[PDB]
């Protein structure tokens, strides 16, 4: 997150870290056994870290659980980034409490101008690298599909939306992929891609979660 703020410990209790000997992407807990992330975060052997604040120090409220299955969308397109959504089933159910909690899936798609919370442990610098110890948060509005396609001509599909600030300085960045975009307590987006980070007229692009609720439910039922 560039231009964000320290969230506060466990204030985003559905935020998870995906770890492979280092933090490499985020995700969102949607029930005791399943996490939503981005398909471009797929790899074998993912370890899911729940209850985290300082990702570099074990503080006491963490639950580490290995992924048993990591299921990319069956039509994920690694070039266009269409359908950039992945479901991770946990080897054992997480213990849900105040600091580890699921986030609701949407019942409708959100509208432009709606304010959302974007979070992660990604880079805090738009040109360089500085990775935070603690979780960072950003409040950002959904932009109109018109503005999104103007920023990214030919590159935005029906399963993507833009959120952020066209003036630059405030955006998700490397290490935030797969994490949540929450609007009015509903998981509306997944950090996916952009042209760099926090650059003028290049807002973040996010997977449109509302289009996948049926696929999510069927996948949970079939695994």
């Amino acid at each position: 997150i560039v231009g964000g703020y320290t969230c506060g410990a466990n204030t985003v209790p559905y935020q998870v870290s995906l770890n492979s000997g280092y933090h490499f992407c985020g995700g969102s807990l949607i029930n005791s056994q399943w996490v939503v992330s981005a398909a471009h975060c797929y790899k074998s052997g993912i370890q899911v870290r729940l209850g985290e604040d300082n990702i570099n120090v074990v503080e006491g409220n963490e639950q580490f659980i290995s992924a048993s299955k990591s299921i990319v969308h069956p039509s994920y397109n690694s070039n266009t980034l269409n359908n950039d959504i992945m479901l991770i089933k946990l080897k054992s159910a997480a213990s849900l409490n105040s600091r580890v909690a699921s986030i609701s899936l949407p019942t409708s798609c959100a509208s432009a101008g709606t304010q959302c919370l974007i979070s992660g442990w990604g880079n805090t610098k738009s040109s360089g690298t500085s990775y935070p110890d603690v979780l960072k948060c950003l409040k950002a509005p959904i932009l109109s599909d018109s503005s999104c396609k103007s920023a990214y001509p030919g590159q935005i599909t029906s399963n993507m939306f833009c959120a952020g600030y066209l003036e630059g300085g405030k955006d998700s960045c490397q290490g935030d992929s797969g994490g949540p975009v929450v609007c009015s307590g509903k998981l509306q987006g997944i950090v996916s891609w952009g042209s760099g980070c926090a650059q003028k007229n290049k807002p973040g692009v996010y997977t449109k979660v509302c289009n996948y609720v049926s696929w999510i439910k069927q996948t949970i039922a079939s695994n």
Partner: peptide, 14 residues
Amino acid sequence: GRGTKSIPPIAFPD
């Protein structure tokens, strides 16, 4: 010019 936000990122010439 399109780049994912993973560690490491995949970023294309477009």
